Amino acid sequence: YDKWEMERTDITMKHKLGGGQYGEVYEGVWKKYSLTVAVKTLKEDTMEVEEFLKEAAVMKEIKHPNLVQLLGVCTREPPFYIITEFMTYGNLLDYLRECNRQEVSAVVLLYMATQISSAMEYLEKKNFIHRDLAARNCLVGENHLVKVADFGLSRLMTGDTYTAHAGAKFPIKWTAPESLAYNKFSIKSDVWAFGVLLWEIATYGMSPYPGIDLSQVYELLEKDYRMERPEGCPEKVYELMRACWQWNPSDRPSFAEIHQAFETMFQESSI
Ligand SMILES: CSc1cccc(Nc2ncc3cc(-c4c(Cl)cccc4Cl)c(=O)n(C)c3n2)c1
Numbered sequence: 001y002d003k004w005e006m007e008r009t010d011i012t013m014k015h016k017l018g019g020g021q022y023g024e025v026y027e028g029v030w031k032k033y034s035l036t037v038a039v040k041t042l043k044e045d046t047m048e049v050e051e052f053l054k055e056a057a058v059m060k061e062i063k064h065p066n067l068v069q070l071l072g073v074c075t076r077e078p079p080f081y082i083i084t085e086f087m088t089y090g091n092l093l094d095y096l097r098e099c100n101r102q103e104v105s106a107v108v109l110l111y112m113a114t115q116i117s118s119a120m121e122y123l124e125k126k127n128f129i130h131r132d133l134a135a136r137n138c139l140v141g142e143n144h145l146v147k148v149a150d151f152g153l154s155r156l157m158t159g160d161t162y163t164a165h166a167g168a169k170f171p172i173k174w175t176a177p178e179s180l181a182y183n184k185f186s187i188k189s190d191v192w193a194f195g196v197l198l199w200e201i202a203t204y205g206m207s208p209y210p211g212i213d214l215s216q217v218y219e220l221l222e223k224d225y226r227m228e229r230p231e232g233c234p235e236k237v238y239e240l241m242r243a244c245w246q247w248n249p250s251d252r253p254s255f256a257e258i259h260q261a262f263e264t265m266f267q268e269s270s271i
């Protein structure tokens with residue numbers, strides 16, 4: 001018995017989301033509650049069923065106000081379904097790039113970084129690591145509400161470090177040194193990515209290391225190169241941005257600390 005298992009009939013598929021950049025995800029309707037939802041689907045021919053099922057499973061364990069919420073699943077017979085709440089404003093990257101900056105202001109940017117750090121602190125305590133933390137994987141809802149995508153989560157079964165399947169490709173500009181070097185990800189690797197995410201938020205969606213060819217990024221980081229403080233970015237925040245980019249992962253702060261710092265900046269800023 002699985003309280004989550006539901007009827008594939010209850011849902012009404014509509015169209016694809018994010019132009020496919022997230023896979024087989026569509027906007028749907030849950031007839032019963034006339035609720036608009038998000039539906040991840042698995043195709044006919046795939047060796048994904050194993051992974052697809054684990055994602056769903058993981059999602060039944062996580063519950064945080066800033067992590068996308070699972071509503072139900074259809075995993076008995078194909079096509080498989082993972083049903084989640086619907087985020088009306090898409091991903092945080094597009095949101096920042098199109099938003100009105102008089103509305104989505106400094107306090108708002110601060111507020112969004114707090115929410116994301118809040119979710120990461122939850123994941124950190126829960127012993128999970130996120131394999132793709134970036135603005136493009138943060139969803140936005142009304143009132144600058146931000147939730148981190150639950151897809152791409154791995155649970156640390158033993159160590160505090162997760163090794164990815166040898167020969168896996170990850171976003172260079174968001175990947176911590178140790179990950180690019182040895183395919184090893186810890187929560188500290190997420191801290192690094194979070195620091196990059198901060199940079200995206202502070203630049204209203206600019207591409208990280210703009211103009212710098214990928215083949216050079218790792219070396220530049222070795223030689224101690226880091227992105228400069230974005231125009232308008234308060235020093236306190238850049239200082240935290242820089243701490244997230246310590247070369248040694250153990251020198252990087254914990255999400256508990258980062259969250260704490262933001263909760264404070266956010267609060268004293270709203271005064
Ligand atoms: C600009 S319009 C636009 C464009 C893209 C996206 C959205 N909204 C949205 N809302 C909710 C989701 C939920 C998921 C999801 C699912 Cl279906 C299963 C497991 C984990 C996650 Cl995070 C998802 O992948 N995506 C892309 C979602 N997207 C709106």
